[PDB]
Design a binder for this molecule. Structure first.
Ligand SMILES: CCCCCCCCCCCCCCCCCC(=O)OC[C@H](COP(=O)([O-])OCC(O)COP(=O)([O-])OC[C@@H](COC(=O)CCCCCCCCCCCCCCCCC)OC(=O)CCCCCCCCCCCCCCCCC)OC(=O)CCCCCCCCCCCCCCCCC
Ligand SMILES: CCCCCCCCCCCCCCCCCC(=O)OC[C@H](COP(=O)([O-])OCC(O)COP(=O)([O-])OC[C@@H](COC(=O)CCCCCCCCCCCCCCCCC)OC(=O)CCCCCCCCCCCCCCCCC)OC(=O)CCCCCCCCCCCCCCCCC
Ligand SMILES: CCCCCCCCCCCCCCCCC[C@@H](O)O[C@H](CO[C@H](O)CCCCCCCCCCCCCCC)COP(=O)(O)OCC[N+](C)(C)C
Ligand SMILES: CCCCCCCC/C=C/CCCCCCCC(=O)OC[C@H](COP(=O)(O)OCCN)OC(=O)CCCCCCC/C=C/CCCCCCCC
Ligand SMILES: CCCCCCCC/C=C\CCCCCCCC(=O)OC[C@H](COP(=O)(O)OCCN)OC(=O)CCCCCCC/C=C\CCCCCCCC
Ligand SMILES: CCCCCCCC/C=C\CCCCCCCC(=O)OC[C@H](COP(=O)(O)OCCN)OC(=O)CCCCCCC/C=C\CCCCCCCC
Ligand SMILES: CCCCCCCC/C=C\CCCCCCCC(=O)OC[C@H](COP(=O)(O)OCCN)OC(=O)CCCCCCC/C=C\CCCCCCCC
Lengths: 603, 128, 178, 156, 459
């Protein structure tokens, strides 16, 4: 009976079986990672069927299967939404996870706890599937917190390293800052709309007020690492390369953008929140690209690229184009995941070297990673007919052909320029010059796992944009007419960025040296934001937490008021009363005094 | 000449930029010698207690005991009622309470007035 | 890291350390090898000009002034080796470093495996028990009165003697235990 | 195994007790400096410099390599705030004031230009989008029993 | 109700007539059997209550608390079995007798059809706890902690007895059923204001309120592991149960009256969560986290809405289990290290991996990770407060963030990093400790499947 529901629940269910078998004997053998990888691949090829059913018919469904607790009028149930977004995002995420695990079987070959690593990866995948398929706000919050906790665990994978623990706590802190707005949104929706269910919320909110949308925007900014709460995403590179390639690049970090996409019927009916989202996305993409164009760590550069892409996604959201932002999510997953595969291959081949100053000629020394990175950089930049072109070109056209802010449009164009800039920076400083690695050459790629995992995402980043764009139904009005110069704005900006950054990098061979300027220092230290904001508030908090809350009030004044005052008063009274020298003279004089006082007072 | 680096509380002076280190004197050298002598005596005691095979227990650290005792149990007996202590305690223990009371009282008064006149539009509000 | 520190740093130690830091930061600035070689030789030549200077006050004037210049152009993001205290793999494998005495707590069924290892460990334990008893007296007699002045330990001087306080230096887990 | 005299006491006033307290905390008399004698119960605990643990030498063989501390050395009052997992005081290549002003300046400039762009938006040389049936009245909200004002859209 | 009370009474002769080396086995088995017997009470009705007799009744607010109180005793026995090893048989029997008497007093307290009987048992629970704290305590400050714990409670509760006898003199009955059906409004008068204060402050002191929370760190730090467990898990919930029971008579006076308490709790949760960040002690940190959670419960009770009451009940149960688990973990560390300071023993995940997993789960459930019942109560109380006022959320937001911080801080200081080189007496974790943690944690993850079972009478 209508196999859509059975298949779309079976994928998620079979995604959980290795977690059940994690206590079995297979978990103690060396075949566990292959078991998990095969399970993920079968889940992907099984979830491909509901995608085909949607493409044929446009069939949509809600599955509210298990009834959880019901409080008064409100009903809470295990409900799954399998809308276009869910049935479209699930296959892409499963394919990316399959490639990531295939790569990780080789990248984590010498890691003693590799079964636990694979288990951690599968748990994150399950939680993200829960987040994507959620129909009510409570299940979505469950996935929201689960992905954050798995990210905390995976970032601090090497728990003997202080900086990994610091980065994990940073991620938790920023995610809780977003969680504040998430909880505000949940509370407002329950109080005013009387439900956490998606269907009820859309129905009873024809003109959504500011507060729930501001809460949703705060949560999205927290989880997507916008300018206010950006540094945790670059700081999350402390984890293993597969963790950075799966979670912090293509699947987890689009959680905020996906959440804002989920509530697009209420986003389109408000004009202020749209403006805030647009401005936040523009400033985030600009600042992150500006920081990226000057970094030396390849992982940092690519993470800043991811953050800039998230900013571009929220720019797309702010101009009331949620479906196009979803398409951007799907394409960016492919090509940015493959970009991290290439980066991790380079890092592993250079004996855990991440600085680009110690990598020179790799165009010929290692060709397959070379062509994969070239194709990924071309797709990111937006080459016509490439995967990037289908989404990013429409992004540029829609931002240009809309009643938006002039400053936001300018910042988006500059962000595109800087994207081209750091792309050519990566290529030039990792691939073209003379070798700069230590003399003992350990460069090797002849491994089936790495090659197959990279080439699958290569086929994806070549053909997925074309096939998906021509297979999905049309969902928005096109900009079918456009000035010729304004149609070519994206290409001319990209080529200008290429040529200018190439010229600026080509002057490094010159035998002339000068000290850096203030702009370079500002861009290299991340706008000085991670310095001040990670030293001024925390100290000012922690000191207070010891000086005022702990010692001044709790240890001293609260103690002075009730217990110490009582002790002192009772001690003084006892000393005064009991200090009698035993002279009956004084006793009987007091007796006479009280006798006469009683004779004078009580009658 | 080059622009000068200005130290702050959260960004201290660099080790190699202190004017004090370049001013060397026999008294300073003797001070450093006795500092390193104390450090080496403590290190020798710790390693003597550390290496021994017979010992099978945590080595007790008097410095840690002093730190914890001073942080926790030595505060009140050394307290003295002082204008600084009085004003800081009164502020940090009373001001936030009255501030939040004022804020919430004003909010609830506004809400109560709006519900009395009825221009609040509480449709679909059934759970509280 | 292995050697004991000194009570102070001499002028030549300071100039050598400044030379090391400046050359490393110039290598960080000059990505390519030929540019780095040219500028490093230019810097070495500049450095050697004041080599035969005898005035101590002038000597103090030199390098400290250079240090301010070094601080101005110190390449805010210098290159750091992966295992260095600022590297990206500084403490990656500290979580795999398990102490040796933990083996004393293994179940006998676990000690049934690897019997030769535990026999050699027993020989090591016997050697430690004898050597420590010798070392206590040796260090007591060799230490200067009033407490040690420098945290450096003397070597063994007899035939059957072992270096004092050797057990926890020899029995380090490994650099990369797993 | 710690005795009564080994615990912190009241503030030192005389040089003899100052020297005795300096001896208690295993430091020099000249290096010993208690906190200023106010109401807060610092008592007789040394005021070590407010420098963090991150900028301590990472090559010295500490007894606690992760915390960068030695066994018998005195402990800073705010140690748990400086544990390399928290706020640090390591000097930066750029001065604190320059970063603050530069950071503050960048943020302020961005806020002002976004406001200006809100004041001066961008659009196209076009009129508003036109919709067929009374500006989609029946299927945007409904209310068919009101018969709103009809609108005819201009043919050009 | 006697089917639970009589076996608990029979626990005493069984313990005292037990063989010298079979007390722990006999006590644990029969305590678990009594806990199983207590499970029958959970099947509540949507109607009035389970009125067994004139003296005792059951309610879906009383039933989860009774089940938790019964379940806590085997855990306390297993935790106490370790450090009482070098102790004479008579004193171990006395310890078990005190635990049994505490359970009996709590069981009679939670049913308690009449308010004077409730007060008598509510204050009878005080003696066994005081004796346990001041007798089998390690440090020399256990006497001062016992004095604080006794006198805070009695100063709070002495006006309550006068208020109760006055209320019975005026109304004519102290029975809960009669009081609920015959409740009449209290006029806003000075005498009524002082009657409200006398009725409320006794339960406020035991939560405890932020102003009156000083006794709790002393009592928790100085008590043995069983004492800490019973204080954090059950004894703190007595104030919340008393407030929920006695608040019915108080209206409409509660609205004006509630502001001083609402502000104190909303600021004190922030203050105590921030205090947790700078602590050198595990037990003190857990105590302050308990203070923050109970401040939130105070806010929920004072708002006095249905969602508030359900959230308060769920949060009380979840906090009891979580805090008992946290104290058990800290005690397992202390029994090896004998220091009870976080910064000394470090990197315990490398040496004890399963115990580190238990630490992670306990810190996650203290952090209120969904869909755990901790977050269920958290979210219900937060929503009720938002409906009460849209500004409260800001404070709540801070609280949540701060909570997570110190939780993971406690997880990072002791489990992650590098193990202290000198400590070598860290033996592998015993089966008893792992069983203790499993028996602490499994009920939470079972209850999250059936939240309505702990949501109180207003479900
Ligand atoms: C996800 C679906 C699962 C389905 C299969 C059933 C799984 C049942 C698991 C029950 C929980 C385990 C028991 C608790 C203590 C651990 C027991 C133990 O000793 O393990 C040793 C055993 C062997 O250890 P070892 O190798 O000897 O020791 C290695 C070291 O100790 C090193 O150890 P380690 O580092 O390997 O640690 C173990 C591992 C796992 O260990 C744990 O941390 C256990 C506790 C995890 C949750 C923490 C509390 C958070 C609140 C969640 C409440 C959920 C309640 C649901 C009902 C539960 C009923 C019991 O660490 C983690 O993976 C952390 C996971 C964090 C999860 C974050 C997201 C949580 C929400 C997810 C959604 C849940 C509801 C979905 C509803 C919507 C869709 C249906 O390892 C395991 O058994 C691991 C179990 C697999 C991980 C499960 C994580 C998710 C569980 C969620 C609760 C059940 C959900 C059911 C519906 C799912 C749909
Ligand atoms: C309407 C007509 C449309 C056509 C328009 C015109 C077409 C193009 C014309 C070209 C225009 C300029 C393009 C060249 C950019 C400059 C590149 C350069 O020379 O850098 C070297 C040079 C210094 O290099 P260095 O210190 O020696 O570094 C040593 C080695 O090179 C170390 O090198 P390394 O190996 O470590 O790494 C190399 C890296 C390191 O290089 C860097 O340091 C990068 C830093 C500067 C480049 C960033 C430019 C992006 C500008 C956006 C700024 C947004 C507003 C920010 C507000 C700040 C408020 C304070 O360089 C790169 O990778 C490439 C840099 C990025 C260039 C590629 C894309 C830029 C072209 C797009 C710009 C706009 C066109 C949009 C297109 C759409 C059409 C509308 O940079 C500069 O001199 C800065 C020039 C411009 C900076 C503007 C900010 C000045 C702010 C001063 C205060 C203003 C008052 C504020 C008051 C506020 C109070 C409330
Ligand atoms: C220390 C840690 C915390 C401990 C617990 C603290 C919580 C208990 C505090 C009690 C809260 C307030 C008590 C009385 C509130 C009544 C409302 C009053 O504040 O408002 C005005 C009252 O005005 C003035 O407040 C009059 C009273 C002034 C004298 C009270 C002392 C003020 C500060 C003392 C605080 C010390 C508390 C602790 C004692 C040990 C309203 O004016 P009015 O319409 O006319 O009176 C209405 C009441 N009627 C109808 C019964 C007549
Ligand atoms: C910190 C707790 C909060 C304390 C707030 C106030 C503290 C200052 C008060 C100090 C004690 C004052 C003692 C005298 C109070 C007199 C109140 C009174 O008599 O009202 C009784 C009232 C009406 O009297 P009638 O004459 O019978 O009525 C006929 C005419 N209408 O009847 C009652 O309600 C009796 C209830 C007893 C009142 C309680 C008295 C004690 C104060 C209330 C408790 C607050 C302090 C709690 C201590 C906290 C420590 C944890
Ligand atoms: C497994 C081995 C057996 C396989 C063969 C049997 C296959 C299933 C056939 C069983 C018949 C169906 C059945 O289980 O009956 C319904 C029965 C529930 O009873 P209801 O009456 O519908 O609702 C509760 C109130 N009465 O279904 C079930 O509970 C079983 C499956 C439910 C979903 C599985 C649980 C997954 C989620 C776990 C909890 C997660 C936290 C809570 C969710 C948060 C949502 C806000
Ligand atoms: C009207 C009168 C009301 C009286 C209320 C009495 C409250 C109960 C506390 C009585 C304590 C008075 C005695 C006292 O404190 O002595 C000082 C004594 C010295 O210790 P000793 O063992 O006696 O010997 C020291 C020298 N070797 O100090 C202490 O140790 C005190 C330690 C415990 C403090 C207890 C705090 C109790 C007060 C808490 C608040 C409630 C108080 C009751 C009224 C509250 C008002 C509503
Ligand atoms: C309001 C939130 C207030 C912030 C709470 C502060 C809590 C203090 C206690 C935290 C514990 C200390 C700590 O975590 O250490 C700092 C730790 C270590 O520093 P690293 O940079 O990683 O250095 C490592 C290299 N050696 O880093 C941090 O996590 C500090 C994070 C502090 C962030 C606080 C500032 C947040 C401000 C955000 C405002 C913007 C909001 C967004 C608006 C969006 C609207 C749509």
């Amino acid at each position: 009976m209508n196999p859509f529901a059975s298949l779309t629940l079976t994928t998620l269910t079979i995604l959980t079986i290795p977690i059940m078998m994690s206590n079995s004997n297979i978990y103690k053998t060396n075949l566990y990672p292959n078991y998990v990888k095969t399970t993920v691949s079968y889940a992907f090829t099984l979830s491909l069927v509901p995608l085909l059913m949607f493409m044929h018919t446009g069939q949509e469904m809600i599955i509210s299967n298990w009834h959880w607790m019901t409080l008064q009028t409100v009903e809470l149930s295990l409900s799954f939404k399998m809308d276009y977004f869910s049935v479209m995002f699930i296959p892409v995420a499963l394919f990316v996870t399959w490639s990531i695990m295939e790569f990780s079987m080789w990248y984590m070959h010498s890691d003693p706890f590799i079964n636990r690593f694979f288990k951690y990866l599968l748990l994150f995948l399950i939680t993200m599937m829960i987040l994507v398929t959620a129909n009510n706000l409570f299940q979505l919050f469950i996935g929201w917190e689960g992905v954050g906790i798995m990210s905390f665990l995976l970032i601090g994978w090497w728990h003997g390293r202080t900086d990994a623990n610091t980065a994990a706590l940073q991620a938790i802190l920023y995610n809780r800052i977003g969680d504040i707005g998430f909880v505000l949104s949940m509370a407002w929706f329950l109080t005013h709309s009387n439900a956490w269910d998606l269907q009820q919320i859309f129905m009873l909110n024809n003109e959504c007020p500011n507060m729930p949308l501001i809460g949703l925007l705060l949560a999205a900014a927290g989880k997507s690492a916008q300018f206010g709460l950006h540094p945790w995403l670059p700081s999350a590179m402390e984890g293993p390369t597969p963790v950075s390639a799966l979670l912090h690049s293509s699947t987890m970090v689009v959680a905020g953008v996906f959440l804002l996409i989920r509530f697009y019927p209420l986003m389109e009916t408000n004009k202020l929140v749209q403006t805030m989202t647009l401005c936040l996305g523009a400033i985030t993409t600009l600042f992150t690209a500006l920081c990226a164009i000057t970094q030396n760590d390849i992982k940092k550069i690519v993470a800043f690229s991811t953050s800039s892409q998230l900013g571009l996604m929220m720019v797309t959201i702010g101009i009331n184009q949620p479906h196009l932002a979803f398409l951007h999510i799907c394409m960016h997953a492919f090509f940015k995941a493959m970009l991290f595969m290439c980066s991790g291959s380079i890092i592993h081949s250079l004996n855990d070297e991440q600085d680009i100053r110690k990598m020179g000629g790799l165009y010929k020394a290692m060709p397959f990673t070379t062509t994969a990175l070239i194709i990924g950089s071309l797709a990111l930049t937006g080459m016509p007919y490439l995967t990037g072109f289908y989404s990013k070109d429409l992004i540029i056209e829609a931002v240009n052909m809309s009643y938006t802010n002039a400053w936001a449009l300018l910042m988006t164009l500059i962000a595109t320029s800087l994207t081209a800039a750091y792309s050519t920076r990566i290529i030039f400083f990792a691939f073209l010059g003379k070798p700069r690695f230590p003399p003992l050459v350990l460069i090797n790629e002849n491994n089936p796992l790495l090659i197959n995992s990279i080439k699958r995402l290569l086929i994806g980043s070549i053909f997925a944009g074309f096939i998906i764009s021509n297979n999905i139904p049309p969902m928005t009005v096109p900009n079918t007419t456009m000035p010729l110069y304004m149609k070519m704005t994206a290409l001319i900006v990209t080529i200008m960025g290429f040529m200018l950054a190439l010229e600026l990098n080509n002057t490094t061979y010159y035998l002339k040296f000068k000290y850096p300027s203030q702009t370079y220092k500002f861009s290299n230290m991340l706008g000085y934001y991670p310095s001040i904001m990670h030293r001024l508030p925390t100290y000012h908090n922690l000191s207070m937490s010891q000086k005022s809350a702990s010692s001044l009030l709790d240890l001293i004044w609260l103690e002075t008021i009730l217990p110490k005052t009582t002790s002192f008063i009772q001690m003084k009274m006892s000393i005064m009363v009991s200090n009698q020298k035993g002279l009956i003279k004084l006793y009987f004089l007091s007796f006479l005094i009280t006798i006469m006082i009683s004779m004078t007072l009580f009658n | 000449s080059f622009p000068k680096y200005k130290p702050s509380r959260l960004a201290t002076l660099p080790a190699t930029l202190d004017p004090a280190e370049y001013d060397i004197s026999p008294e300073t050298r003797k001070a450093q010698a006795e500092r390193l002598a104390i450090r080496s005596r403590l290190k020798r005691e710790y390693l003597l207690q550390y290496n021994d095979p017979n010992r099978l227990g945590v080595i007790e650290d008097p410095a840690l005991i002093r730190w914890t005792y001073a942080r926790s149990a030595n505060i009140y007996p050394n307290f003295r009622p002082t204008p600084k202590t009085s004003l800081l305690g009164a502020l940090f223990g009373i001001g936030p309470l009255f501030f939040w009371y004022y804020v919430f009282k004003t909010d609830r008064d506004k809400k109560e007035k709006l519900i009395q006149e009825g221009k609040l539009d509480q449709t679909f509000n059934i759970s509280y | 890291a292995f050697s004991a520190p000194a009570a102070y740093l001499t002028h030549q130690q300071k100039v050598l350390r400044l030379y090391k830091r400046a050359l490393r930061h110039l290598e960080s600035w000059c990505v390519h090898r030929d540019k780095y070689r040219y500028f490093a030789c230019l810097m070495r030549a500049r450095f050697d000009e004041h080599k035969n200077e005898k005035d101590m006050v002038k000597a103090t004037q030199l390098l400290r002034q250079a240090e301010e210049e070094f601080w101005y152009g110190q390449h805010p993001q210098p290159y750091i080796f992966p295992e260095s205290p600022g590297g990206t793999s500084y403490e990656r494998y500290e979580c795999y470093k398990v102490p040796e005495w933990c083996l004393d707590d293994w179940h006998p069924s676990e000690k049934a495996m690897y019997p030769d290892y535990f026999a050699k460990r027993e020989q090591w334990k016997r050697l430690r028990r004898e050597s420590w008893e010798r070392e206590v007296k040796q260090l007591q007699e060799e230490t200067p009165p009033g407490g040690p002045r420098t945290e450096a330990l003397p070597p063994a001087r007899k035939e059957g003697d072992l270096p004092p306080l050797w057990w926890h230096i020899v029995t380090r887990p490994r650099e990369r235990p797993m | 195994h710690v005795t009564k005299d080994m615990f912190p006491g009241p503030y030192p006033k005389t040089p003899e007790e100052r020297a005795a307290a300096a001896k208690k905390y295993n430091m020099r008399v000249e290096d010993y400096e208690p906190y200023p004698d106010d109401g807060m119960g610092y008592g007789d605990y040394p005021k070590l410099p407010d420098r963090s643990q991150q900028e301590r030498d990472p090559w010295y063989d500490w007894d606690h390599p992760d915390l960068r501390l030695n066994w018998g050395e005195p402990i800073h009052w705010d140690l748990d705030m400086y544990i390399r997992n928290r706020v640090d005081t390591s000097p930066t290549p750029v001065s604190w004031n320059t970063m603050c002003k530069h950071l503050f300046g960048f943020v302020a400039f961005m806020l002002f230009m976004f406001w200006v762009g809100e004041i001066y938006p961008s659009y196209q040389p076009v009129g508003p989008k036109q919709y067929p049936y009374n500006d989609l009245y029946l299927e945007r909200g409904g209310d068919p029993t009101k018969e709103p004002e009809p609108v005819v859209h201009y043919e050009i | 109700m006697l089917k639970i009370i009589i076996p608990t009474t029979m626990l005493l002769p069984m313990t005292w007539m037990s063989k010298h080396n079979m007390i722990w086995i006999n006590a644990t088995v029969h305590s678990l059997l009594i806990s199983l017997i207590s499970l029958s009470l959970l099947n509540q009705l949507g109607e009035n209550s389970l009125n067994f007799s004139l003296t005792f009744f059951s309610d879906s607010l009383s039933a989860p608390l009774l089940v938790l109180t019964t379940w806590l005793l085997p855990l306390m026995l297993m935790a106490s079995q370790s450090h009482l090893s070098k102790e004479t048989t008579t004193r171990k029997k006395l310890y078990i007798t005190m635990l049994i008497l505490l359970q009996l007093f709590l069981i009679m307290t939670f049913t308690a059809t009449e308010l004077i009987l409730f007060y008598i048992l509510f204050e009878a629970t005080l003696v066994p706890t005081l004796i346990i704290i001041t007798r089998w305590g390690n440090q020399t400050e256990r006497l001062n902690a016992g004095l604080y714990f006794l006198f805070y409670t009695l100063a709070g509760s002495l006006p309550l007895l006068v208020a109760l006898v006055y209320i019975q003199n005026t109304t004519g009955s102290l029975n809960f059923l009669i009081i609920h059906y015959w409740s009449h409004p209290l006029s806003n008068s000075w005498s009524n204001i002082f009657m409200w204060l006398a009725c409320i402050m006794a339960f406020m002191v035991k939560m405890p309120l932020y102003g009156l929370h000083l006794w709790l760190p002393k009592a928790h730090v100085e008590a043995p592991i069983a004492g800490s467990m019973v204080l954090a898990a059950v004894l703190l919930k007595l104030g919340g149960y008393g407030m929920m029971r006695i608040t019915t008579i108080l209206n409409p006076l509660t609205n004006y009256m509630a502001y001083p308490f609402l502000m104190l709790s909303m600021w004190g949760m922030i203050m105590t969560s921030s205090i947790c960040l700078r602590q050198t002690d595990l037990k003190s940190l857990i105590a302050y986290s308990s203070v923050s959670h109970m401040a939130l419960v105070i806010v929920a009770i004072m708002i006095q809405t249905p969602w508030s009451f359900m959230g308060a009940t769920a949060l009380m149960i979840a906090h009891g289990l979580t805090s008992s688990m946290l104290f058990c973990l800290a005690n397992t560390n202390y029994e090896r290290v004998h220091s009870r300071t976080m910064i000394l023993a470090r990197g315990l995940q490398t040496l004890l991996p399963l115990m580190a997993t238990w630490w992670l789960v306990a810190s996650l459930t203290n952090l209120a990770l969904p869909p755990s019942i901790n977050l269920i109560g958290e979210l219900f109380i937060i929503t009720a407060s938002f409906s009460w006022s849209n500004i409260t959320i800001i404070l709540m937001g801070m609280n949540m963030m701060i909570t997570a911080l110190y939780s993971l801080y406690m997880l990072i200081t002791t489990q992650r990093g590098k193990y202290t080189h000198h400590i070598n007496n860290i033996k592998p974790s015993f089966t008893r400790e792992n069983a203790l943690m499993a028996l602490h944690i499994l009920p939470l993850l079972l209850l999250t499947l059936n939240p309505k079972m702990i949501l109180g009478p207003l479900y």
